[PDB]
Amino acid sequence: LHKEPATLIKAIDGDTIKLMYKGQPMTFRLLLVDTPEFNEKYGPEASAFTKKMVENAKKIEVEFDKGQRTDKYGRGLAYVYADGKMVNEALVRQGLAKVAYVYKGNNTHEQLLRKAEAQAKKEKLNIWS
Ligand SMILES: Cc1cn([C@H]2C[C@H](OP(=O)(O)O)[C@@H](COP(=O)(O)O)O2)c(=O)[nH]c1=O
Numbered sequence: 264l265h266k267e268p269a270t271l272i273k274a275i276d277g278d279t280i281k282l283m284y285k286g287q288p289m290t291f292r293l294l295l296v297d298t299p300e301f302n303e304k305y306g307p308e309a310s311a312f313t314k315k316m317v318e319n320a321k322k323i324e325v326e327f328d329k330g331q332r333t334d335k336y337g338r339g340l341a342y343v344y345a346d347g348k349m350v351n352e353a354l355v356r357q358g359l360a361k362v363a364y365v366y367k368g369n370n371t372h373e374q375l376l377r378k379a380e381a382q383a384k385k386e387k388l389n390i391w392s
């Protein structure tokens with residue numbers, strides 16, 4: 264897989280971000296994770312975590328997987344990086360997202376994220392507390 268450039272348009276919530284990609288505004292949904300909705304427990308914390316991570320970043324990138332690049336809502340499906348750190352993994356490591364929505368053929372980073380989730384669970388962080 265390979266990283267491509269994007270720029271932040273607006274934080275939305277823990278697992279969706281509005282980015283400009285190839286010059287076009289798009290909502291991206293983070294592959295292989297599920298944050299709580301803003302109205303659920305840890306929802307506000309997830310949103311703030313993602314927001315901080317993408318607003319502080321000098322460089323945003325998106326990485327598509329091998330399979331579908333947009334979902335049925337027209338959201339881009341990618342791993343999103345902030346100054347080289349994957350947001351998807353960072354949410355999971357902090358106990359602010361569960362590994363989820365693992366579809367065959369868009370699951371390149373599945374085991375990386377499951378290792379993060381195991382460590383968040385051992386530490387009893389956030390969702391796992
Ligand atoms: C993460 C992801 C979500 N989706 C769809 C499945 C779910 O459909 P439903 O809307 O029918 O529940 C929805 C979950 O996204 P949200 O967690 O953003 O609601 O997005 C995909 O199709 N592919 C994906 O890779």
Ligand SMILES: [Ca+2]
Binds near residue numbers: 278297298299300
């Ligand atoms: Ca969600």
